[PDB]
Amino acid sequence: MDTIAARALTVMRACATLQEARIVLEANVMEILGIAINRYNGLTLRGVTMRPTSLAQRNEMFFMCLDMMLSAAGINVGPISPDYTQHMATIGVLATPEIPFTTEAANEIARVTGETSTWGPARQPYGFFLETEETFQPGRWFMRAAQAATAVVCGPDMIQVSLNAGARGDVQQIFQGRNDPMMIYLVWRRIENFAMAQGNSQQTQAGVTVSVGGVDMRAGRIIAWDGQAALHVRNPTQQNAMVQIQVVFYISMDKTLNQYPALTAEIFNVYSFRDHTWHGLRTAIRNRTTLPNMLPPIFPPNDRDSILTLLLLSTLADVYTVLRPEFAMHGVNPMPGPLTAAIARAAYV
Amino acid sequence: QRPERIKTTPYLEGDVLSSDSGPLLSVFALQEIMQKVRQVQADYMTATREVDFTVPDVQQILDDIKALAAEQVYKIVKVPSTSFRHIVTQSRDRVLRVDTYYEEMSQVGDVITEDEPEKFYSTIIKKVRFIRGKGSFILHDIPARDHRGMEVAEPEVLGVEFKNVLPVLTAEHRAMIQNALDGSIIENGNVATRDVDVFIGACSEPIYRIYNRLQGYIEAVQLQELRNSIGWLERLGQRKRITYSQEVLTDFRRQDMIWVLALQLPVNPQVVWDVPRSSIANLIMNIATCLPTGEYIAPNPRISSITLTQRITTTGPFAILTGSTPTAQQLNDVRKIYLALMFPGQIILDLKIDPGERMDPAVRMVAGVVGHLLFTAGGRFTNLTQNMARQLDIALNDYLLYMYNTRVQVNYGPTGEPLDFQIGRNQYDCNVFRADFATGTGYNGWATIDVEYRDPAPYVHAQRYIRYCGIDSRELINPTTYGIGMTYHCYNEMLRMLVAAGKDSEAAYFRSMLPFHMVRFARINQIINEDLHSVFSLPDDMFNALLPDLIAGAHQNADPVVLDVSWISLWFAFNRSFEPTHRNEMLEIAPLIESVYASELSVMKVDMRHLSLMQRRFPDVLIQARPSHFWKAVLNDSPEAVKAVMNLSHSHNFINIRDMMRWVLLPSLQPSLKLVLEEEAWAAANDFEDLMLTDQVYMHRDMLPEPRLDDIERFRQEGFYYTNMLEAPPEIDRVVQYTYEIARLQANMGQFRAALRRIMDDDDWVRFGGVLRTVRVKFFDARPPDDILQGLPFSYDTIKYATETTIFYLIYNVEFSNTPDSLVLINPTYTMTKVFINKRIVERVRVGQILAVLNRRFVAYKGKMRIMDITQSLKMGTKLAAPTV
Amino acid sequence: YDTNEKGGLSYATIKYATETTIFYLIYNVEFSNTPDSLVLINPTYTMTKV
Structure with missing residues (x-):
């Protein structure tokens, strides 16, 4: 086969x-x-x-x-x-x-x-906390009622924990939930200057520690976090503190654009216009498939057929290029003018 | 011109020894095998039926088969056979028609008797055959007459004899019939172009059946079928590297030509290999057809001795190699060797000893080594006999141990078995060159792959393709890896041993010989899996089966032929290489011959099949049966050539009842025009009444119808015919059923008559079932013979059943001088036997009804067209313009 | 290109040339010639060009 x-x-x-x-x-x-x-x-x-x-x-x-x-x-x-x-x-x-x-x-x-x-295992494309419904202002203090330590999201790959003087606690649970990460790479920093509930500036004192699975880890260094180990943050300082933990990147078993060598360029080649004949053709072909008929799929496919089809179509595209074939198609009307980025733009629905 | 034959360097250019060909070896092979047997049986105490192991003419048998492609089954006529006849009674208003078919059929085979079952069988075959022949019509150019703007068929092309009737016809009847005659038109008529004429003419059913099936074939089997089959050859052409023509096949069909192909090309491998005890015959066929013509080459004299000065020359360690070939007595003995390895494990080798001719023992040494590097005892297939190998190991052993120079450290093994020691200042086992058949550790391809399945084969029995010493013929065309090192593992190890132990002086000979050796082998491979894989080639199944089955001593149907050689021959075989010259002429037509064989083969199987069932169909008719009987009668009525191909091995005097039964029951067939016709005609045969032999034979005391003649002119009636053929059988409850056995017993006891009489007196009926009886139809003008009226369905000389059974038709005729009661007699005239057929043989008809027979369709090729059988155009070297898949 | 009927079948044969001729046809004329003389109702054709 x-x-x-x-x-x-x-x-x-x-x-x-x-x-x-x-x-x-x-x-x-x-x-x-x-x-x-x-x-x-x-x-x-x-x-x-x-x-x-x-x-x-x-x-x-x-x-x-x-x-x-x-x-x-x-x-x-x-x-x-x-x-x-x-x-x-x-x-x-x-x-x-x-x-x-x-x-x-x-x-x-x-x-x-x-x-x-x-x-x-493959380096994922976007920020960890991308599919989140709520986000808080970065650097702004926030302590949920009755908690001594309150971790929260402030961006796509950003979280910040609000620790009271002398307070400590585990944080891992904010990360967990999103199906399956194999190894999250972290890097935490101290928010030396953060906003208080009222607006006044506040300093985070040197001494706050972060330990994974027990072992103490430095600030500003990347960490091989298995997502399961205990993400423990301590605040031995006699003041309020706020630390930001950054998911620099993570790996999962989901198919990325790096599953097959320079797949990207191929896809580009497939989705490229060339001319109305090619365009319409390539469109009509993908209409039979699970692939978007004329716009790069958001999510990189993961089935043999899809990848295959793309490669074939990509090559058949080059064949079209060298051969210069000229024929008709139902619903296709070739505009003979030299062809500009403008004419191309218009073609895509 | 010479593809790979191109000799680049003088090293390959040696002298010419002898030369062989397909028909040459094919005969030689048989010969040798036949001498074998006589020489043993005639030599020792033997006890078996006498057989004359004759070597038949391979060429003439082959040439006879090629002659079969010509013989066509279809017969082109301009008018169909009669089919119907009319017999006139005294009457002027009524006649009786007869279906000619039934009459002819009546008298086809011999009368049927429970005594001769063989007679019975052939009798049937003849009858079936008859039908098939009476049905192969074509109807080309018909007598089209013009009449009132319409083109009608001339009464000759219809199916009736009515001229008899015409003179007694009433102006009215005459007219009616005339209209019916110019009634049947040529359907399409006014069209010109046409190509075919469609009319209405009459015809006997069974015959019609064949005509139709045939007609269909010729119209179904056209271009495409032909196209495929040719493409197949076109494909096999590439496998055999055929030199092609500049011509191509245009699938242009002229409007005049209707093609008739009789055999398709892709032949079913099995039909050939299904034939019991075929193995040998097949093999020989494989040789005689595919084995090319070539010459044995000698190596370069410079390979051994070389001149440095007019006075100084080197001497090869084997000065004995100047021996002039030990007559054909052994030259042929070499031919055995070559032919043996050229046919994988199909032919095995063994010593042979004439206690006479004293040879120098050295011969054994050389042969011990030689044998080891030229024969394959590899665990893939094997060339030699189990004991054959031992003798070579002993030859090797004995000679590794013969030290004509300073002796080396021989550290023996615990086993007394030869080659246990380790000669060499570095030891080295000689145990490696032992002889394991499952490994092949001593002889050839011990560490090699020689059976390489690869690529789809044009044949399909064998997809395998042999690589002796893993040298693909390609290495000749273009090298693979230098000329220095060609060495395959074994020959290499052989050298190492020769060194470590005895001496280099000899190992040098083999070192330099090596290339020559492998070349010879490369060519051999080429020849095998390329030049000669045919249908007779032999399936990989059986191939793979050979080795293990040989070890266990199973019962391999394809028992390898064991040929006996000569110690000397090995040396000679080793120093000759064989280089093919021309591919035997038989090759390009080979496939066709194959088709002919296979298809004719199957047809027989078919016949035999149905005949075996016969015994079970009517167990009473053929008590003394035995399958040999029908298969003998079938073999009888079928083509000689084919039979001879089967009997090449003389198998026919060995095939046991069971063996043949299996072949009948086997279900691999090769379609052919003949095949379909035979089978179809055969099918209609299943009726039995259509064969003219029934179970429906009764006895019932009956009076002869003596009528009152009051109005003589009123005997324009049905002329009052009588007939013992029943309109319909009697009520089943009023019939006393009789069996062969029942009648037999009653008769032996001398009670049969009595009982029979009683039944007759009681006005009851009695049927004689179980047996068939040939049935005949006779007509009479007056009081027929008593032996007919009062004729009985058995002899009384023990009660002998069956007999002929005559169905008569007595016509009553009377003159005006007849008194009304004049026909009456004081005492009745009796008629006993009566028959029933449920087939309208003789029928009472009106007159105007005569022409009703018409009925049947009929398509006749217009005179313009030419029917040609494209069956002999299945040569290999033909390429088509339309490539096909 | 040739067509041969054998049996019923009918085969064909197509061969491509190996020789090709380049030529130079010099036009030679005389005084008795009319401007017309060199023109003909229908053209004269040349197929091979190298």
């Missing part, structure tokens, strides 16, 4: 080699394309050249890549163009062990399937 994708990939990547005639094909490439194109034509009954030039020759080749790309992704776009028609049989060509694939493509897929099928 992965083999199928590797093939369809190799083919496309190979077609991209066909820049503008003045080329002497890499012997290796010839062999591959020939076998593929051959088999494809034997199932498509279409006339694909190994070295296109006319346009109609180019279209045919693109269409091939398209048919393969879709088949490798397991997509059925249906009646989207009068000029193109998807042959479902394309899958049978790709399933035939008679077509080879590059080491490049093999590893490329192996990586996607490899990671996509399991989990791993």
